[PDB]
Amino acid sequence: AGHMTSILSRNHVKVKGSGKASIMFAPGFGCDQSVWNAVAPAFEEDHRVILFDYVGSGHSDLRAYDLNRYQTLDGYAQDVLDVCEALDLKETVFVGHSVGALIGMLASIRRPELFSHLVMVGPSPCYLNDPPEYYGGFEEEQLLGLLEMMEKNYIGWATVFAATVLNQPDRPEIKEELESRFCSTDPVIARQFAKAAFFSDHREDLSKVTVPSLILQCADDIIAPATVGKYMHQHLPYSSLKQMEARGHCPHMSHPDETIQLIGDYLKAHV
């Protein structure tokens, strides 16, 4: 019933700025569009900026949620496609953080003509260790452990996982923020999201990406170690790799200035 508006509502879609091209920003796990507050507004000057939420975010009607659709990342890739269709876009730059980068990647394989560039901030095609070929950074039991803790002691998991992704003990404020964001997210949906994200394996899909991609690798990132970014650079047909000085897995919130710089340099070079 009035689908364009229903999509715009379900995904809290907003457009800002103005320009010939547009940049869609996609949050990482447990985050809403506001995590982009320190980065995204720097691009409104020259581009229409698109922000949106995945279903399941605290202030979410949740009456838009569907058990089956979001069981796998495809359901998430479908939301991105839905937003692009509602906004009636012909093409757009896509900036995604963490699992958001992969969600964007999946949608690009389904509809490549819809994406000009894929800017990935801290991506991983698989979090599982697979020596000798691949080192995702986690043993199945480690991920299975966090999943279990998510069910038994959610609040506890929120603070433990927040500490882990940031990997910056001398930066408590960003730490408490991520923690709050995790506590504010529907736990049932969050667990479905975590499972779908941390157990997926997209290594075989890298070769299918035909859209140009920029991989921003973080330093001392526990979630997405340097080896995963290097591996992605190697297997993605059209890509470039950039080692950030930024530490942890969330540079867009802990080091917004460098994040803005690298993304700006890239778009400036491919315009």
Topology summary:
Layout: H1 3-10, E1 14-17, E2 22-26, E3 48-51, H2 73-86, E4 92-97, H3 99-110, E5 115-121, E6 129-130, E7 134-135, H4 140-152, H5 154-166, H6 172-184, H7 187-198, E8 213-219, H8 226-235, E9 239-247, H9 251-254, H10 256-270
Parallel strand pairs: 2-3, 2-4, 4-5, 5-8, 8-9
Antiparallel strand pairs: 1-3, 6-7
Helix pairs in contact: 1-2, 2-3, 4-5, 4-7, 5-6
PDB class: signaling protein
Keywords: alpha/beta hydrolase, signaling protein
Assembly: monomeric
Characterize the structure shown.
The chain has about 270 residues and is α/β, with parallel strands linked by helices. The protein has one domain (about 1-270): Alpha/Beta hydrolase fold, catalytic domain (Rossmann fold, 3-Layer(aba) Sandwich), CATH 3.40.50.1820. About 40% of the residues lie in helices and about 15% in strands. The chain has helices at about 5-10, 75-85, 100-110, 140-150, 155-165, 170-185, 185-200, 225-235, 250-255, 255-270; strands at about 15, 20-25, 50, 90-95, 115-120, 130, 135, 215-220, 240-245. A seven-stranded mixed β-sheet has the order 1-3-2-4-5-8-9, with helices on both faces. Strands 6-7 form a two-stranded antiparallel ribbon. A hairpin with a 3-residue loop joins strand 6 and strand 7. It starts with a helix and ends with a helix. It is classed as signaling protein. Keywords: alpha/beta hydrolase, signaling protein. It forms a monomeric assembly. The entry is titled "Crystal structure of RsbQ".
